[PDB]
Design a protein around this ligand. Structure first.
Ligand SMILES: *[C@@H]1O[C@H](CO)[C@@H](O[C@@H]2O[C@H](CO)[C@@H](O[C@@H]3O[C@H](CO)[C@@H](O)[C@H](O)[C@@H]3O)[C@H](O)[C@H]2NC(C)=O)[C@H](O)[C@H]1NC(C)=O
Ligand SMILES: *[C@@H]1O[C@H](CO)[C@@H](O[C@@H]2O[C@H](CO)[C@@H](O)[C@H](O)[C@H]2NC(C)=O)[C@H](O)[C@H]1NC(C)=O
Ligand SMILES: *[C@@H]1O[C@H](CO)[C@@H](O[C@@H]2O[C@H](CO)[C@@H](O)[C@H](O)[C@H]2NC(C)=O)[C@H](O)[C@H]1NC(C)=O
Ligand SMILES: *[C@@H]1O[C@H](CO)[C@@H](O)[C@H](O)[C@H]1NC(C)=O
Ligand SMILES: *[C@@H]1O[C@H](CO)[C@@H](O)[C@H](O)[C@H]1NC(C)=O
Ligand SMILES: *[C@@H]1O[C@H](CO)[C@@H](O)[C@H](O)[C@H]1NC(C)=O
Ligand SMILES: *[C@@H]1O[C@H](CO)[C@@H](O)[C@H](O)[C@H]1NC(C)=O
Ligand SMILES: *[C@@H]1O[C@H](CO)[C@@H](O)[C@H](O)[C@H]1NC(C)=O
Lengths: 264, 518
């Protein structure tokens, strides 16, 4: 037996929050009676601009939607045109020859360790210890027999995101409001402790009898006051909803909080 | 400079950065450069490794399955030109299955002499669609940008804009940058291959890609033609002979290369012979060696189909370079190519939709005969205006003019500098309720269409305020109206953003409002 080929067609799906389904095909050349697969998933942190882009005025929000949908006469060509159209066959051939000379030993911020387990005879595997809507890198190595003496097969990577936590990116508590001169308002709220990936910005919809006026609050500007200050509102009983925006799009809003902009 | 280091053969590095020390002082590599299968490597392993001496390769550069490698701006900070003498299945620069890669970092590469660029299946790779390979490669029809984070996740991967050169492709117009700290330089077509300087002075004809001194065949970074003795030459004088088509060697040099591997057979190197006054691996047919000296000697005497992939580039506001490939089934001796083009109409929703939503950045948005030529330059065009092109190949004379069906592709010219520059001074209106209405004349010919107006105003001594005016706003107010202002003199600036990115900032204008006190 030799080092097996990589697991072919590794797909994944987001079954439920904190859960992920991974479904793949057996390797092309198992090179031996295949014993099992090694499912190794590691957390993937944020990127640079994910904490720098002032998404209130920079650009659209980059989201990574989960691929849950991945759950589910004629005449042959002659030999001349077949040889003429053979263009990418030798390409992938030499790339797999390159990867054939590697191994993966069966070992037992960006400081996230990996979690490795064995899947005996299942091309599908459910992971139930994840974070709602966060990037996860799963590396699978089709281990044949003698995969400990020779080393398991080469790594095949895939990236997936879990299901967002249902109504988690909302404000995890009651908001507070403060009146200020010029009939100004300052709102302060907590941040979701376990957001669906990351709270990129907050949307504050307020207005007279209808949340018509809108305001954006970036990620870092929030920490300057634990919230944001609307500079002017007309004197009167006003209302404002705060529907945050996580990495999974806009979330939920607790309540259109009331505040006294006028005076008694 | 032009002679910074020594010569190295082609090498394959695997499994660790330990063997990468063999190419420390290397400047040129007479072969390929393979760095692949680095599994146990860590990002900190690469942060303290560099090769500033490596400036030029000959065949190509390959990177495949090198974990922890986030960028290359530190590995090859001075790689300038790949000669591309050989090709990896027409690909002159391959980057495949790079896991932790998020950008390119090859800011100093300015030309690939021959081949294509293929970058596929790098799930974390950004900064990939924000680069124009036309100013870098000659033939970009063969290429691969798929299964990448920028094609599916919309990396954004903005460029340094505290300014990067913004090139035009068939329909799109996006800035050019390799990292968030390196703008991709592009130079005028007048000396497409000679090179460039910082001030725009073009390089010498003998240089390639770049030179440290303008119009000097000695201070070149890489030589276009054969190199010899610290100076790029068009053709080396006798007795030196051309070797590997890039540097000329004398008889004594390519002699040792012959005898050395003739007996050692270390890698079966080429027994270079001097034919056509050039030390060539093998002398061409109808010629043999003298059997005593390496100088070779001549032996005694012994309707069509659719035109393929027509892409278009624009290197000017009134010009367009249209390139294509002959159809797969000419179905006859192709006499001349038939080209039709017409001005497209911009999408109607763009004239009325809101743009002050989710950031202020915008998305990437007659006939003629051609005889014995696969390209055509089209003049007399409107700047940045989308043009729908129709191209057909014809294989019969005009009196019997029957030929292929109509192909279709979209073209777009280059934007202009002052086309988006708001003209005329901004005017204001006085009101008793401290409500001001602002008016400014937009140019009648924008690069595409003006989509919004970035308005910035500020009273003397106060803090700068930022506004966003959508299509509908100045469609009704003919501008923008501000309410509840503090009495005093203000300083206002505007920048109109069109389909060709952000325009210019208007000169800070100042107006006076009666303070109702004097
Ligand atoms: C990058 O630099 C190169 C070198 O100056 C530019 O090159 C072109 O150079 C190649 C290399 O010799 C020429 O091609 C070869 O083409 C000839 C054509 O007869 C063929 O006989 C040879 O067997 C070989 O295949 C190519 O013709 C030439 N083209 C032009 C327009 O000069 C290249 O254009 C530069 N690219 C950029 C983006 O600046
Ligand atoms: C999708 O998730 C559900 C629960 O959210 C899974 O239901 C479970 O099935 C697994 C089998 O792998 C069992 O180990 C669990 O005990 C089951 N839990 C419950 C509450 O029924 C389901 O298997 C997952 N996969 C699919 C395809 O539905
Ligand atoms: C051509 O290459 C040289 C060096 O390889 C580049 O010069 C760097 O250029 C800046 C000014 O532009 C100098 O301050 C540095 O000292 C140069 N570096 C070195 C190592 O000499 C030059 O910019 C390149 N030309 C272009 C057009 O990019
Ligand atoms: C390999 O597997 C087949 C069927 O799964 C079995 O019949 C055979 O005995 C196995 N061989 C070894 C060496 O285990
Ligand atoms: C390091 O890489 C070289 C080839 O680059 C390989 O021969 C060697 O086995 C690897 N491991 C060590 C410990 O050098
Ligand atoms: C590279 O240059 C340094 C300094 O001149 C020298 O010590 C070293 O030996 C050179 N590289 C090799 C492989 O010798
Ligand atoms: C654009 O490229 C063509 C092709 O060589 C050239 O003739 C033309 O001058 C170029 N445009 C400019 C503005 O230099
Ligand atoms: C096609 O026409 C060209 C002239 O346009 C001529 O040189 C060539 O021989 C012709 N070939 C055939 C097959 O008709």
């Amino acid at each position: 037996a030799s080092v097996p080929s990589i697991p072919l067609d590794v797909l994944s799906a987001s079954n439920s929050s904190s859960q992920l389904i991974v479904k793949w095909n057996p390797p092309s050349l198992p090179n031996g009676n295949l014993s099992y697969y090694i499912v190794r998933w590691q957390r993937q942190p944020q990127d640079g601009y994910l904490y720098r882009h002032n998404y209130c005025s920079k650009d659209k929000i980059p989201i990574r939607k989960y691929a849950d949908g991945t759950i589910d006469c004629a005449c042959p060509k002659t030999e001349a045109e077949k040889q003429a159209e053979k263009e990418e066959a030798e390409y992938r051939k030499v790339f797999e020859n390159f990867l054939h000379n590697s191994i993966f030993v069966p070992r037992p911020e960006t400081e996230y360790p990996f979690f490795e387990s064995r899947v005996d005879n299942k091309e599908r595997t459910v992971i139930s210890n994840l974070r709602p809507f966060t990037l996860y890198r799963i590396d699978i190595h089709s281990c044949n027999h003698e995969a400990e003496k020779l080393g398991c097969s080469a790594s095949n990577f895939v990236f997936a995101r879990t299901m967002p936590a249902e109504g988690a990116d909302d404000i995890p508590g009651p908001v507070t409001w403060e009146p200020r001169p010029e009939n100004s308002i300052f709102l302060k709220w907590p941040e979701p402790e376990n957001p669906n990936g990351l709270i990129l910005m907050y949307e504050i919809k307020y207005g007279s009898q209808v949340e018509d006026q809108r305001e954006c609050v970036s990620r870092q500007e929030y920490r300057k006051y634990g919230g944001a200050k609307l500079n002017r509102l007309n004197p009167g009983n006003y209302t404002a909803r705060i529907q945050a925006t996580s990495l999974s799009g806009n979330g939920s809003w607790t309540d259109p909080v009331f505040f006294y902009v006028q005076a008694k | 400079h032009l002679y910074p280091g020594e010569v190295c053969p082609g090498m394959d590095i695997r499994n660790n950065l330990t063997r990468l020390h063999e190419l420390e002082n290397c400047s040129v590599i007479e072969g390929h450069l393979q760095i692949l299968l680095m599994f146990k490597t860590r990002p900190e392993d690469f942060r303290d490794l560099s090769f500033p001496k490596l400036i030029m390769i000959t065949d190509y550069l390959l990177l495949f399955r090198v974990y922890g490698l986030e960028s290359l701006k530190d590995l090859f900070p001075n790689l300038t030109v790949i000669r591309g003498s050989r090709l990896f299945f027409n690909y002159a620069l391959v980057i495949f299955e790079m896991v932790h890669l998020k950008e390119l970092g090859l800011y100093n590469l300015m030309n690939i002499t021959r081949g294509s660029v293929r970058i596929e299946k790098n799930n974390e790779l950004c900064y990939l669609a924000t680069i124009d390979w036309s100013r870098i490669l000659d033939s970009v029809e063969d290429n691969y940008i798929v299964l990448n984070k920028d094609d599916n996740e919309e990396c954004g991967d903005i460029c340094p804009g505290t300014n990067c050169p913004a090139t035009v492709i068939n329909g799109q117009f996006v800035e050019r940058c390799w990292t968030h700290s390196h703008c991709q330089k592009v130079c005028p077509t007048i000396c497409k291959s000679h090179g460039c300087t910082a001030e725009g002075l073009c390089c010498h004809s003998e240089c390639l890609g770049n030179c440290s001194q303008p119009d000097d065949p000695t201070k070149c970074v890489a030589c276009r033609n054969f190199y010899l003795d610290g100076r790029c030459v068009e053709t080396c004088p006798p007795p030196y002979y051309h070797f590997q088509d890039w540097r000329c060697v004398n008889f004594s040099f390519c002699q040792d290369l012959h005898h050395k591997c003739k007996n050692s057979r270390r890698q079966g190197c080429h027994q270079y012979v001097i034919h056509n006054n050039k030390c060539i691996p093998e002398c061409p047919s109808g010629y043999t060696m003298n059997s005593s000296n390496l100088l070779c000697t001549p032996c005694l005497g012994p309707n069509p189909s659719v035109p393929l992939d027509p892409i278009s580039v624009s290197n000017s506001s009134s010009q367009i370079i249209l390139k294509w490939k002959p159809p797969s089934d000419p179905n006859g001796n192709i006499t001349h190519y038939l080209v039709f083009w017409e001005r497209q109409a911009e999408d109607s929703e763009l004239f009325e939709l809101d743009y002050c939503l989710k950031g202020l950045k915008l998305p990437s948005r007659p006939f003629e005969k051609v005889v014995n030529k696969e390209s055509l330059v089209i003049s007399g065009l409107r700047h940045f205006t989308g043009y729908r092109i129709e191209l057909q190949a014809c294989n019969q004379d005009t009196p019997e003019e029957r030929c292929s069906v109509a192909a279709y592709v979209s073209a777009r010219t280059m934007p202009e500098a002052k086309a988006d520059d708001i003209v005329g001074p901004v005017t204001h209106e006085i009101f008793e309720n401290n409500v001001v209405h602002l008016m400014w004349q937009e140019p009648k010919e924008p690069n595409g269409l003006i989509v919004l107006y970035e308005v910035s105003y500020r009273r003397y001594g106060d803090e700068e305020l930022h506004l966003c005016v959508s299509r509908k706003h100045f469609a009704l107010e003919r501008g923008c109206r501000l309410r509840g202002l503090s009495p005093g003199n203000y300083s206002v600036r505007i920048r109109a953003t069109s389909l060709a990115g952000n325009g210019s900032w208007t000169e800070p204008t100042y107006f006076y409002v009666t303070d109702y006190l004097d």
